[PDB]
């Protein structure tokens, strides 16, 4: 329920979904009680949180940040833009980050509320808690 | 109360608007099931119609029956334009927001789901008044005791 | 020819036109309901009010002829006109139901459009959605449904039924606020009504609904295209409404509509479903799909090495371009060429030796009409909408009775006088073909009448023009197949099934070395084929037809279409020099197996689920007027 | 805000006799000039007629015309408060450069070349603005599809990792637009600035700074910046092209996602523009609800700029307080609009809903406290003077740069220019409400910080006036102009009568019946003048909707300020210009 197993994610703020990310980190919601350290350097991070829409111009740059992370890693696509392309079916928008980087949790919303982002993280933890529990 | 959360389909429970009751004679519906008459106003008003999938048929008795209603929330703006376009009081936005999941498939609502969401939303906050926030204790941490008035 | 003013804007208008006509031509939108360019003026809806400055009075523009220097004002500059538009639209909405969510007219409704643009914008006369009633009677029909509360009683249907189609099947049931439209005879499906759908199309609202289209879609979710209807030789231009398979609608034809010229019959209005029925859209060998290139090689071998033992049976439902390419290939293969119309039509035209084929527009010049043969209204229906002069008759008369035809004898034709149009149907002369043709040939030379042959199949007259002198007799070709003189048959369509029953082709599949069937359907004659080749239907090709409305060229827009013409032209690239032909003739008399009917005139309308219901109800009825 | 005065029009006609043609629209006044005389007219309008302030420039695509591209220019006379619009056709796909007249127009020319393909002879290394070097299309062209050209199969890797090969959603398109490579990004970087110094500092495309998506390029000599450029496009999604495919009312939610920090402000600018084109009056109750909520967003937006500005220099204690106050504003907006950030509160004709019960009591509880908390941030910041000296002398913007670069919002006011559209070109209710326009004297980073601070105070005074006005209105007063045909009525009306239902169906199926014509209107958004230039050929969908970003022009002056300075001042400079990746379309 409450695990000392810490998670070190890198928040990739690209659009509006990033503003809601800051509100979750602030004094109103306490995302620390869940063991989220939030390191800023991608070299020492294991969870890639894509918060915002990914433009085709940013796709090669984002993929590089992913391959540059240690192998025990997960990825959370916050909002529909990073999940499936969101409300932008246009010539310059990448329809979902899972097309260039596997994602483990999709958080719907435009943008999701701070609690929705928290529930989404618990879901990632739920997965990991029983990912090392089967085999 | 005005939160624009996961969509829902209000059900046939007796509290339908005059517009729907006026066309009930043309519909093939079941008590406690979706009110939708497949008018396509929600999807037509929506700037992202591709996320919807609505299908209706004409039964051999002449009545109309809705056979499919799916929504893909990952391409939704949560803008509320569709609810504005519903002329029968069927489409609605609930308070449901804990929908993060592991696959694009879990973010696709079928009709059966839209009904369950609305039924639950009406069951828990149907008679709740339209207030700026519904609970003052959860807000007291940040605001404190507010001097309300009539 | 005349200068007028609409909101102080000078506009030139041809004398004889109305203010409403002129305004619409110039893009000045004036709301209107009862005016229809094809019907007589009614002046009943009053929605077209304009302020006539010259007389300081509100006047209806649909009835106002243009006069030199007249000055009118529309809602653009007149509050009086604006107030009456709001009142008139509010009046119509008083008992109009809140049916838009399920009404088939939503999106293309005159009341919904005008009511939202010029209406009251709010409810002024407070009527509950639950009290939106008007007197009503069941039309007792499986195809049409009347919603009297949606009716904005405008009398377009009554006028169209009486002035255009002429069936006189509707009447206005009791006067006043509750005036409601009722069929003169119920059940409607077997009454004088010809189920042409014109009432559905002229209705400005969803009062008259097409049951086959009800609730299946929404008007704004369909694609639209216009082309030539090939279900008979008239050549009407109709609009096909279809879906593609995306979020809006299924990949099929949903309904069809006439243009504002109201040229359409039941076959054209309810037969759209024949386009969706068991289509053959890919080349196949046996039951296995095969690439067109491989089929082209098979045919190239058949005609190159065995053309002199190959017979080609044309279809009159083929456009000129395909007929010509196939005929050119035949002449390069030394094959036999025929068409089922060689049984009756070609024998008649050979004796008549010269005929007339004027356009429908030229029908105005006739003083009288003589119908010889079948029921013209059942063969080329829309023609019955233009034969408004005196009508004489020799032959079968069922739906033609609406024209009050006078029966006569061939001996009486000698005494008619002045620009007589003789419309003769060769498929209904049974053994008197040569005799009748000989008689009409005398009449055309001595008295100068116009002898117009009315084929029952769309491009049969062009087939005759391109096959005269070289066609083989259909029975002779079949007889040659039994003898073994013809080893391969390329049959186009199912025109042949009007003379031979299915079993014959079940046996021919065994006897022939190659039985090639070119059809649009996976069922029927194509089931017995060795090689199946798709044949295009209306809206799937750019082919021209020699019809009563002229030489009309269709449009290709249905996305699942098989490129019929491209296939044949590709095959033709393998045939350059003309080699010749073989002709077989025979005196055996083949009798037609079935008489055409208003709701079933060919193998295409036969595959329409809608028309089949109408046909089953009316097949035995022979008297509709007396 | 009037357009060209009769006097300057004649002096322009007497000088360009058969080369210009004066014209008027329901909402714009301007000129049509021959190609070879475009620049002489502009230089005349700016130098000899005082239209020094550059507003915007773009192009319209008319494939049915031989020239096919009409250049559109909009200038402003601050001395007389007038606007002018100048149009001209492109000769063989070219146009004259105007960057020597208005340096700020350089980026507008870059945007046009990337969206339409128009080259500006003499642009000084014209490169695409948003797309990468080598893109093969011009998306704003009418024959280019909105979804681009799908060419590559790009399955969902998460679905492939689980064997599920079937499409995961009924709207999942496997074919995708071609994706660039890291090498493709390198060419746009090198093709941007021509080597001038020792090292090529590269702060992007993605960097851990405050405005992480903004890409910068510095030419350094040790620690000094000689040359400098910016590369945007890290958030370009085709807004202007999405509008061409939507009805007017359908674009409101897309305006929230431009400057996501102040959504209600974006909606007000857009809606106020469309309401001019359609000629829609807004009832009083809605005008005060718009004005009040637009000001609550300005406070909310400045708090973010202040919180993120404080976060840039440590002192995270200010970030927590700033966001503590933002959470209060969001509790009011979310309770009334229904969403925390992308409100989608305004509607064409008024507001979505009336105020939620008890909403005025919460605002009063906020207006009483917020004044005291503003005094905390003033002294909690100036407490540490280690940074106070780091701003009182750098980044000075002269009034010449305000007009030459087209600056607006706090950036222009901090330099002395009292350019505030809430007063110069009133909208919603800023005429019936009394407030003051803060203006600086030095024009440095500090003056812009102080300008934004009093704007929050001035906004509290505006909200206070909107509260007393709303209390005096019966809750019976309308918040929607239901009598206009282009205004979609609330569902409650449609559930009740047919007279309302037919309006909903008409607008939703066909769109509003917009008349032909053109309109240019702008709103005083927290970061500057948010302009909307709409061109209508008639119908439910606009032919072209050009969005003039006030923040975009505020960033165009960045290379001028950091030049000849130290790179350490880049963090404080960028923060004092308050840019947003979202307003770069
Ligand atoms: S999901 Fe919505 S809020 Fe998040 S970046 Fe995309 S459009 Fe903006
Ligand atoms: S608008 Fe309402 S009734 Fe119409 S299709 Fe959507 S949910 Fe169903
Ligand atoms: S909330 Fe907006 S984007 Fe989502 S389905 Fe409804 S109208 Fe479409
Ligand atoms: S007739 Fe027109 S206004 Fe009446 S319900 Fe049907 S679509 Fe609506
Ligand atoms: S559909 Fe045609 S024939 Fe039948 S009643 Fe109407 S107008 Fe007459
Ligand atoms: S049924 Fe249609 S066409 Fe006939 S009167 Fe009524 S509204 Fe007019
Ligand atoms: S008359 Fe002939 S051409 Fe005209 S619609 Fe009927 S079948 Fe088609
Ligand atoms: S249109 Fe003139 S009265 Fe009906």
XYZ file of C-alpha atoms in Angstrom, chain A residues 37-133:
97
model
C 12.037 11.430 -5.502
C 11.770 13.394 -8.796
C 15.332 13.711 -10.019
C 15.858 16.208 -12.874
C 18.799 14.598 -14.728
C 17.626 11.877 -17.177
C 20.916 10.015 -16.718
C 19.836 8.984 -13.186
C 16.075 8.488 -13.757
C 13.893 5.423 -14.322
C 10.386 6.810 -15.136
C 9.725 9.084 -18.112
C 6.654 11.238 -17.548
C 5.680 12.839 -20.884
C 3.339 15.679 -19.852
C 2.246 17.454 -23.001
C 1.917 17.020 -26.737
C 4.825 15.629 -28.747
C 5.467 17.356 -32.033
C 7.153 15.416 -34.843
C 10.087 17.811 -34.377
C 10.457 16.731 -30.749
C 10.036 12.972 -31.402
C 13.736 12.292 -32.250
C 14.848 14.350 -29.248
C 12.441 12.555 -26.880
C 13.500 9.080 -28.057
C 17.117 10.002 -27.292
C 16.213 10.921 -23.696
C 14.570 7.495 -23.309
C 17.430 5.347 -24.601
C 19.696 7.387 -22.285
C 17.905 5.976 -19.157
C 18.887 2.836 -17.150
C 17.111 -0.290 -18.331
C 14.834 -0.908 -15.285
C 12.515 1.846 -16.606
C 8.851 2.725 -17.089
C 6.992 5.474 -18.952
C 3.829 7.436 -18.133
C 1.992 9.393 -20.852
C 0.042 12.157 -19.112
C -2.922 13.530 -21.025
C -4.367 12.407 -24.331
C -1.788 14.301 -26.395
C 1.055 12.146 -25.131
C -1.268 9.141 -24.938
C -2.818 9.073 -28.410
C -2.142 12.443 -30.055
C -5.004 14.078 -28.167
C -6.987 16.792 -29.857
C -4.357 17.398 -32.571
C -4.794 15.127 -35.633
C -2.516 17.416 -37.612
C 0.395 17.331 -40.001
C 2.883 18.214 -37.249
C 1.697 16.245 -34.196
C 2.900 12.760 -33.248
C -0.205 10.668 -32.501
C 0.774 9.275 -29.108
C 4.156 8.800 -27.534
C 3.685 5.036 -27.461
C 4.602 5.075 -31.177
C 8.284 5.752 -30.424
C 8.646 4.756 -26.741
C 6.682 1.972 -24.988
C 4.483 3.455 -22.285
C 3.272 1.607 -19.233
C 0.485 3.897 -18.031
C -1.840 6.219 -19.953
C -3.447 9.030 -17.976
C -6.574 10.392 -19.722
C -7.703 13.958 -19.250
C -7.098 17.317 -20.946
C -5.311 17.865 -18.625
C -5.788 15.336 -15.828
C -6.367 16.805 -12.387
C -3.559 16.527 -9.811
C -5.433 13.638 -8.234
C -5.786 11.925 -11.604
C -2.037 12.179 -12.081
C -1.558 10.731 -8.609
C -3.972 7.863 -9.292
C -2.038 7.262 -12.492
C 1.210 6.934 -10.554
C -0.351 4.495 -8.076
C -1.322 2.445 -11.128
C 2.324 2.390 -12.250
C 3.288 1.311 -8.744
C 0.542 -1.318 -8.731
C 2.069 -2.737 -11.894
C 5.639 -2.765 -10.569
C 4.593 -4.130 -7.144
C 3.335 -7.226 -8.951
C 5.838 -7.178 -11.815
C 8.547 -8.423 -9.461
C 6.043 -10.647 -7.637
